[PDB]
Amino acid sequence: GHHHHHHGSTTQRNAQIAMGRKKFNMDPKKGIQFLIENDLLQSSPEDVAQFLYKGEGLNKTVIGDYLGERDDFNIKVLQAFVELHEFADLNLVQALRQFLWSFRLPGEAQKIDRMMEAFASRYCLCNPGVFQSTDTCYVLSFAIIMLNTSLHNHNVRDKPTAERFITMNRGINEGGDLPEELLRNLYESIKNEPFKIPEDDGNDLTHTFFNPDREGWLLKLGGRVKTWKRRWFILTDNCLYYFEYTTDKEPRGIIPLENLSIREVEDPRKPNCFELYNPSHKGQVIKACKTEADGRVVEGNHVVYRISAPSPEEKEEWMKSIKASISRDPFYDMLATRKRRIA
Ligand SMILES: O=P(O)(O)O[C@H]1[C@H](O)[C@@H](OP(=O)(O)O)[C@H](OP(=O)(O)O)[C@@H](OP(=O)(O)O)[C@H]1O
Numbered sequence: 233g234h235h236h237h238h239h240g241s242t243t244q245r246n247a248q249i250a251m252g253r254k255k256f257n258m259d260p261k262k263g264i265q266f267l268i269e270n271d272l273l274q275s276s277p278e279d280v281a282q283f284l285y286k287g288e289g290l291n292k293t294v295i296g297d298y299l300g301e302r303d304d305f306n307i308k309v310l311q312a313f314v315e316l317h318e319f320a321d322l323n324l325v326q327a328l329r330q331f332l333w334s335f336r337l338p339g340e341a342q343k344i345d346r347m348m349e350a351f352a353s354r355y356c357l358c359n360p361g362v363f364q365s366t367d368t369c370y371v372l373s374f375a376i377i378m379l380n381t382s383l384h385n386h387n388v389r390d391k392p393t394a395e396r397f398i399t400m401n402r403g404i405n406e407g408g409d410l411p412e413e414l415l416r417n418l419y420e421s422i423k424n425e426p427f428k429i430p431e432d433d434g435n436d437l438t439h440t441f442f443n444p445d446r447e448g449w450l451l452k453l454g455g456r457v458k459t460w461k462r463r464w465f466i467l468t469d470n471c472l473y474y475f476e477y478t479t480d481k482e483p484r485g486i487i488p489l490e491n492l493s494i495r496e497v498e499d500p501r502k503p504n505c506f507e508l509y510n511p512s513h514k515g516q517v518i519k520a521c522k523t524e525a526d527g528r529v530v531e532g533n534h535v536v537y538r539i540s541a542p543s544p545e546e547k548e549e550w551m552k553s554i555k556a557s558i559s560r561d562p563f564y565d566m567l568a569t570r571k572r573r574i575a
Pocket residue numbers: 452453454455456457458459460461463484485522523532533534
């Protein structure tokens with residue numbers, strides 16, 4: 233008695249949908265074009281953004297690859313993608329949890345930057361008055377990411393306290409400090425739960441964002457006067473600073489490492505020695521500045537900086553660290569740039 237529906241075949245449409253997803257995961261530009269051609273997706277940046285945001289059956293590494301691109305279309309897709317996230321009334325960690333669930337960060341410095349700038353601009357728009365600049369939010373986002381790595385990667389030996397995290401971020405708010413309890417909250421949130429990463433292979437940026445900066449006592453030979461001194465060394469932003477005491481704010485000297493190289497050397501008296509030197513200008517005095525006993529600051533007089541480590545192991549570690557510093561990391565450098573701009 234009862235009539236029934238005419239249900240249409242869904243075989244071809246389902247096959248097309250699956251085909252499109254398969255193609256996307258191999259090549260996102262090709263997958264998207266296919267879906268548009270087969271009337272399964274509209275061609276506007278906002279429509280493509282919705283498609284990636286839902287991301288059904290889509291590889292989240294591939295989503296990140298596509299969103300990071302320089303192309304005019306991709307830039308608009310990214311902006312629309314970030315507009316689909318709701319950051320209002322979330323703290324920075326909570327907002328990053330949400331954002332970093334939607335895609336996996338690409339490996340290229342310029343791609344990471346475009347995506348994190350888009351994130352940071354959106355966070356600040358949805359949460360006015362929390363941060364003094366987009367730069368502050370961007371830099372704090374990476375301090376939170378670095379913290380995630382420090383607390384949760386077993387390869388990082390010395391785990392930061394809440395107080396270390398608070399003081400590390402002094403001055404970040406366009407020269408001023410963020411609220412102590414805000415920073416503490418961000419710290420405790422990360423400590424209590426690492427960033428949950430989709431399709432996690434254990435090699436994600438959020439788990440492997442290490443701090444390359446170093447410190448330690450070493451023995452150094454003088455310039456004109458060849459005397460050996462125990463000095464406290466700090467390596468940061470491709471410069472080597474040295475101090476009489478760990479408590480000094482004023483350095484004894486500053487050696488920019490740009491244009492330098494490092495080599496292991498034998499010394500008749502001191503073990504575990506290496507030397508900084510200019511490979512392009514043999515015999516030339518290395519540009520540096522240092523303080524004299526009377527408080528004057530003068531240029532260094534060194535052709536080489538010969539330095540002795542207490543063990544072969546520390547010699548090797550310092551050499552590796554200094555070499556890495558000189559070779560430079562493009563992303564670290566861009567972060568350094570924003571930090572200077574904040575100041
Ligand atoms: O203190 P005395 O025994 O007189 O010798 C000093 C120290 O070795 C200095 O090291 P530090 O600055 O660590 O105290 C060194 O400066 P550098 O730091 O440039 O190596 C001076 O080099 P000249 O100024 O080049 O002589 C040298 O005169």
